[PDB]
Amino acid sequence: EMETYVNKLHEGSTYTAAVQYNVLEKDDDPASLTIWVPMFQSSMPADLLIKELANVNILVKQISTPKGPSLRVMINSRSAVLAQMPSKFTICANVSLDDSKLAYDVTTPCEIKACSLTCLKSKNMLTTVKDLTMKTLNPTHDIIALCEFENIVTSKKVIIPTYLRSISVRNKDLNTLENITTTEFKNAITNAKIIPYSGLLLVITVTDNKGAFKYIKPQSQFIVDLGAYLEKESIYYVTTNWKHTATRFAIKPME
Length: 255
Known about the structure:
It is classed as viral protein. By secondary structure, this protein is mainly beta.
């Protein structure tokens, strides 16, 4: 007994596995934290891989690094397929930890409460925000995705504005924006998905390379971190209680 989540955003037999675990220190007065695994390719059917992922054992250790507090993660496993998966890696503690409550330099076992597997396109079909940085040397506008959630327990609405890219826009194009916010673009934002990875991960399907999507490989998935906006939240609480209700955008003059 453990909740499991499988999101197949790609139909390929081969896919990029984006795996996030919500865990609880094995202890009285336990720390609660969320771990995401560095992305890895697999060809095992998703509904089968999730059974293997669910059966691993996880240990963490809080350490100090030039970046601040980090979490060393170790994953134990008897499943042959998970030779494919990183078993030692480090993640930022501020996003990972809810809380207190974890000691430094003590390897700590954690009980798995939930495991989420999202299937994305192959790594050569994934575009990041960093990928698009420096593509425009003199941009005039920033493009922001406004990710709207409902907290299902409180009924409160939450909007997380996340940076996508900066572009240059011709004066002529400002009057309707139809050459920037193309039909392709607007549809891609409206139908964008938010999945449990890196805290939360926005995934935009890039159907064209015109306007707002210039210099992106067509049919790539453009992936965007929201974890940096969730440092003060419990990720498990978020992935359980924040329902993604819409995605809007703003094209803001740089100022």
